[PDB]
Design a binder for these strands. Structure first.
Lengths: 65, 83, 88, 149, 101, 67
RNA sequence: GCGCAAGACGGACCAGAGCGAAAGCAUUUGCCAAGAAUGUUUUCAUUAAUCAAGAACGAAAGUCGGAGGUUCGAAGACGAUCAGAUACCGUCGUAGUUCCGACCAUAAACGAUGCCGACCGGCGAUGCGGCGGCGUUAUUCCCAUGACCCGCCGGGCAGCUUCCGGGAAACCAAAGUCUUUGGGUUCCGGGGGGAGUAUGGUUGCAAAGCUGAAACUUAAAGGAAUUUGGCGAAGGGCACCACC
RNA sequence: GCAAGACUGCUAGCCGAGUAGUGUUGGGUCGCGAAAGGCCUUGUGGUACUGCCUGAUAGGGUGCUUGCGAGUGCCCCGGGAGGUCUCGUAGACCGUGCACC
């Protein structure tokens, strides 16, 4: 069906908001590769930007055939 | 796609593709300088040495032929030289 | 080959394996390796040692095939030749 | 693709665009002509002589450090054989194929490759006859192997 | 017209393959065209394994299996309902059906 | 046979589909109270609900299809 | 159950894998010989995939002279089945099926698609060779090696998708780049029979292969594809005038 | 000669000592690895586990609990309390035919 009172029962849930902005965290998990990607473009190493420790010795693409 | 700047390519595609289909004809091989740690002199050898090679004076064997490049003796220093 | 009374004395004559185990060993997407040597012991016993070999897929392997080259099989077979020559 | 094979193949040398004696090379033309003469006194075919001089002396190629190529200077010195090395290797292969062939009569593909290789040496011999290399009265048959090897 | 992309077999760069005799039939069907059955089964059926288990001298004795390969001609395969027919677009499916039982 | 085996009684958990040539016998998942963990699939004839219990003579055989 | 003897074949490992011009090729080991592809700042310098004459190889079956003849098995014998079998079925069963040489050159020898060269999409795997790059293993340290992983290159057997484009459509990375027609080069077909027939030539011990008509008759013979229709085809649904 | 950074092996006081002995594919300058006898600060804190074999609390191979799957648990020793561990469901075949139209 279609709604004209825009479904108040979750419209008021949309009016409900967390106090935190859900993206302005105290720290953000950033890989070094995207860090040096953003480093050459406009902004260097910021306080909110941290270096991910390398846990990449094991690879991807689990076997299918 | 259709539109590529064939006149002035980025260097990664002519170090990417095969040598015969580059924009200009350029080989992927080079000349190499190798010396023995027990000896003193520096000889000049190809990247694909193609045979057994011995330095003058008969000190040691430098490298062995292999179907790809040459497999060098361990401990020997090397410098990528260009003209 | 030796009885005197109410007893039978035995001797080793040959070793085999069950058909179910060797049928469980043979599977697709792997290489089967066979190697036999006619060997002699210090006494006058002439033996014949049949062995089988089956390749192992790696735990991080993505390939389903998991085969080997022919000269690798020949080298493994020659290793089996010298092992069963040495130990008997 | 190939001439007696149905497989396309792309594997050949590609000389660089640069036409210059390299600066790090400290060798002139007369001395390198002297070790070409010495390796000719050793008595080998010009192809392996060229690859070993390139390999063990570090020169790019001979044709840019002297005015001409090595077959020209061997025929100038006169030590070069009259019979070319291509027909030499091919008729050595033909002698080896027939020497394998007469002991094993039931060998069909060896006979097939044999017919292919006298076809090859005939097609090369016509070109060397029309290029005024071989004499026009030169002939080939299967029974001539002691005179030319 | 042409029914399938291949010809009911797996001959691409050979031109000749070794034929193998059928099991139910005796046809000289080739290896790539015939349907092959590799069945996994125990020595006995499922409604007697317990009756074997109390009749055993050993304790917790594992029941062995039988590992055989069946070579089926296509007429014997369709007669024994091993393989069925599909539609036009339904034949464009290489994957086997899921084994649930 | 010829073994004096005791009578084990069982309690129902879930009703499933019914098999048979004419479709009369019902496959039922059922389980014992003296050993709760082990459960068995049995063939039962007649109308069966959920919540009742069943009397059983043999705990040895396994249920199967119409034949 | 224990041995001996003979002959045949190399299963499972064995794949839309590899090799070979094609037929075709599977137990290990040794000997000989050839070749693709990969790499090359090596050599020769136009030496060319194109081919009537001509030449080699060539599935099975068929013929000729030798020892072997396990198994299977054309003709033949017997018994059932059937209204009627010298057919389907079962038991014996000659020649062949096996080897050496001497033949013939016929297959649905089919990718039912000649050879070379160039151009025009992507994707994920496979095989070879080369190349670069975290990590693990032949136990713990260091290097090359084999194994595994992530990427690239060339050749090959192949797969998925499409308004690139084409076709009558099945379908096509070729069967496209074709009226907006022309890259080079062999063989081959003008409705259907008659008929690959008669004659002649040709080769073959034979069996027979190649070349190859005419008279007369016919307005159809055919290719792709849609809808009830019919299966001694499969799958599913319903029915106390079907069942439990 | 000067400059301070970054990383790591080993030990938990140190010599003996990485001597012996062990093995690997090919090596190396080498992995595993104590002791006898000793001299002296007279011998670092927190932190979880642990099925079996091989070869390290790694790696590899391979199990038990209820048929299956998910939890939970499975080193040694000493005491106490319990005794039917929890949760959900296919775990289906397994005697069966077939002349002649």
């Amino acid at each position: 069906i279609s709604i004209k009172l825009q479904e108040e029962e979750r419209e008021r849930r949309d009016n409900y908001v967390p106090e935190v902005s859900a993206l302005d965290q105290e720290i953000i998990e950033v890989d070094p590769d995207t860090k040096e990607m953003l480093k050459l473009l406009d902004f260097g190493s910021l306080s909110n930007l941290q270096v991910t420790q390398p846990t990449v010795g094991m690879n991807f693409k689990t076997p299918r055939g | 796609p259709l539109a590529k700047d064939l006149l002035h390519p980025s260097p990664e595609e002519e170090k990417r593709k095969h040598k015969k289909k580059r924009l200009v004809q350029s080989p992927n091989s080079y000349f190499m300088d190798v010396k023995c740690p027990g000896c003193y002199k520096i000889t000049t050898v190809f990247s694909h040495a193609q045979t057994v090679v011995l330095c003058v004076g008969c000190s040691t064997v430098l490298c062995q032929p292999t179907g790809g490049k040459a497999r060098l003796t361990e401990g020997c220093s090397f410098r990528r030289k260009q003209h | 080959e030796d009885v005197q009374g109410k007893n039978c004395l035995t001797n080793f004559h040959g070793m085999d394996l069950t058909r179910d185990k060797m049928c469980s060993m043979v599977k697709k997407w792997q290489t089967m390796i066979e190697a036999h040597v006619d060997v002699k012991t210090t006494d006058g016993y002439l033996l014949r040692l049949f062995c089988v070999g089956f390749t192992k897929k790696r735990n991080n392997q993505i390939r389903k095939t998991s085969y080997a080259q022919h000269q690798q099989v020949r080298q493994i077979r020659k290793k089996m030749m010298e092992i069963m020559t040495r130990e008997v | 693709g190939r001439m007696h094979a149905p497989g396309k193949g792309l594997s050949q040398s590609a000389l660089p665009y640069r036409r210059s004696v390299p600066t790090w090379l400290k060798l002139t033309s007369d001395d390198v002509k002297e070790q070409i003469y010495k390796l000719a006194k050793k008595g080998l075919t010009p192809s392996q002589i060229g690859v070993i001089l390139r390999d063990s002396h570090g020169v790019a190629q001979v044709r840019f450090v002297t005015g001409n190529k090595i077959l020209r200077i061997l025929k100038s010195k006169g030590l070069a054989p009259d019979l070319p090395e291509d027909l030499y290797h091919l008729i050595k292969k033909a002698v080896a194929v027939r020497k394998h062939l007469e002991r094993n009569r039931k060998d069909k593909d060896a006979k097939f490759r044999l017919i292919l290789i006298e076809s090859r040496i005939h097609r090369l011999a016509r070109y060397y006859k029309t290029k005024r290399v071989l004499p026009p009265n030169w002939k080939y048959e299967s029974s001539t192997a002691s005179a030319l090897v | 017209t042409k029914k399938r992309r291949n010809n009911g077999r797996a001959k691409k760069g050979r031109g000749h393959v070794q034929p193998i005799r059928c099991t139910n039939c005796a046809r000289c069907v080739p290896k790539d065209k015939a349907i092959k059955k590799f069945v996994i089964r125990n020595i006995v059926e499922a409604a007697a394994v317990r009756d074997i288990s109390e009749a055993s001298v050993f304790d917790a004795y594992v029941l062995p299996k039988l590992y055989v390969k069946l070579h089926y001609c296509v007429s014997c395969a369709i007669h024994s309902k091993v393989v069925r027919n599909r539609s036009r677009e339904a034949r464009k499916d290489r994957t086997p059906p899921p084994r649930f039982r | 046979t010829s073994r004096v085996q005791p009578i084990k009684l069982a309690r129902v958990t879930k009703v499933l589909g019914r098999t048979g040539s004419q479709g009369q016998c019902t496959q039922v998942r059922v389980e014992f109270m003296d050993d709760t963990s082990r459960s068995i699939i049995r063939n039962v004839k007649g109308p069966v609900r959920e919540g009742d219990v069943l009397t059983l003579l043999e705990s040895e055989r396994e249920a199967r299809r119409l034949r």
